[PDB]
Amino acid sequence: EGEYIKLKVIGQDSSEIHFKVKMTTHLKKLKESYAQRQGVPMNSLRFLFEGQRIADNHTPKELGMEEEDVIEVYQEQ
């Protein structure tokens, strides 16, 4: 079985929530969880990896993510 990697999600206010995901995980599931925990609609947010938009069906493998990589969350434009 594949291992989880731990990603740090940083919000507009510098708060952090870490997520464990597999390399094959579609990141919509992370986005949904994050939005839930912030008490806001998922479509009000955009999630960036190294400044690039993370798609619902992006995986960490597709994005070249590794342990301790950072996702930033901004308001949708």
């Binding site: 952090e16 870490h18 997520f19 464990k20 597999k22 579609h26 599931k29 969880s33």
Partner: peptide, 17 residues
């Protein structure tokens, strides 16, 4: 804040509805 780690889990004939 305390550390927060969330585990994202992977992606029927018993059903009754």
């Amino acid at each position: 804040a305390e550390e927060r780690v969330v585990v994202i889990s992977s992606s029927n004939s018993s059903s009754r509805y």
